[PDB]
């Protein structure tokens, strides 16, 4: 997250870190045994880390649970990033509490202008590299479809939305991928892509979660 703020420990209780020996992507806990992330975060050997603030210090609220299964969206296209969503099942259910909690799936899609919370452990610099130990947060509005398409000609599908600031300076970034965009208490987006980070006229692009609720629910119901 570039241009954000320190969230505060366990203030984003649905945020998870995906770990394969190190943090490599975010995700969102959607019930006690399932996480939503980005398909481009797929790999084998995932351990889901819940209850994290500092990802380099055991602070006492963590739960570390291996994945038993990954399910990349049927129609994921890694060239275009269309359908950039996957589900991860935990080998055991997380113990839900105030600090480790699921986030609601949307009933309805969110509109441009709605203010959302984007979070992660990704790079905090738009030039160069600095990766934080503690969770970072950014409040950002959803942008109109028109302005998203104008920023990224030939690239925005019906399964994507833009959020952030056209002036630059405030965005998600590498290492935030797969993490949440939460608006009025519902998971509306997944950190997906963007040209650089926090560049003028290059807002963040996010997977449009409301399009996937039926797939998520029926996948959970049979897996
Ligand atoms: Ca920790």
Closest by CA position to 136, among listed 15, 25, 6, 3: 6
Distance CA 88, CA 67 (A): 6
Q: How far is the CA of 56 from the centre of ligand 1 (A)?
A: 6
Distance CA 111, CA 64 (A): 35
> Which residue shows structure tokens 């380099």?
56
Active site residue 176: no
Set 17, 23, 37, 40: catalytic member: 40
Helix, strand, coil percentages, rounded to 5, for the chain: 10, 35, 55
Which residues surround the ion ligand 1 when the cut-off is CB under 5 Å? 52, 54, 59
Closest by CA position to 183, among listed 122, 112, 121, 100: 112
| Experimental technique for the deposited model | X-ray
> Which residue shows structure tokens 């899609």?
109
Distances (CA, A) of 206 to 19, 82, 188, 197, 209: 21, 10, 9, 13, 9
Q: How far is the CA of 166 from the centre of ligand 1 (A)?
A: 34
Closest by CA position to 87, among listed 147, 36, 50: 36
Tokens matching residue 41 = 């975060």
Sheet with 160-163, strands from edge to edge, namely 5-6, 136-141, 115-120, 180-183, 186-193, 204-208, 160-163
Handedness of CA 188, 95, 70, 7 (dihedral sign): positive
- Resolution for the entry shown, Å: 0.9
Q: How far is the CA of 214 from the centre of ligand 1 (A)?
A: 33
| List of domains in the chain | 1-12+103-210 (no CATH), 13-102+211-222 (2.40.10.10)
Q: How far is the CA of 136 from the centre of ligand 1 (A)?
A: 14
């Amino acid at each position: 997250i570039v241009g954000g703020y320190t969230c505060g420990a366990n203030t984003v209780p649905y945020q998870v870190s995906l770990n394969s020996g190190y943090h490599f992507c975010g995700g969102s806990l959607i019930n006690s045994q399932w996480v939503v992330s980005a398909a481009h975060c797929y790999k084998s050997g995932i351990q889901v880390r819940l209850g994290e603030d500092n990802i380099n210090v055991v602070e006492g609220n963590e739960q570390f649970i291996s994945a038993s299964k990954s399910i990349v969206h049927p129609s994921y296209n890694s060239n275009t990033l269309n359908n950039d969503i996957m589900l991860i099942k935990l080998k055991s259910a997380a113990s839900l509490n105030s600090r480790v909690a699921s986030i609601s799936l949307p009933t309805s899609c969110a509109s441009a202008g709605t203010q959302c919370l984007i979070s992660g452990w990704g790079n905090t610099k738009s030039s160069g590299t600095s990766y934080p130990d503690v969770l970072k947060c950014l409040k950002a509005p959803i942008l109109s479809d028109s302005s998203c398409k104008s920023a990224y000609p030939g690239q925005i599908t019906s399964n994507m939305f833009c959020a952030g600031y056209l002036e630059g300076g405030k965005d998600s970034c590498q290492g935030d991928s797969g993490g949440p965009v939460v608006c009025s208490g519902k998971l509306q987006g997944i950190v997906s892509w963007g040209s650089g980070c926090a560049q003028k006229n290059k807002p963040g692009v996010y997977t449009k979660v409301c399009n996937y609720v039926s797939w998520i629910k029926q996948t959970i119901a049979s897996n």
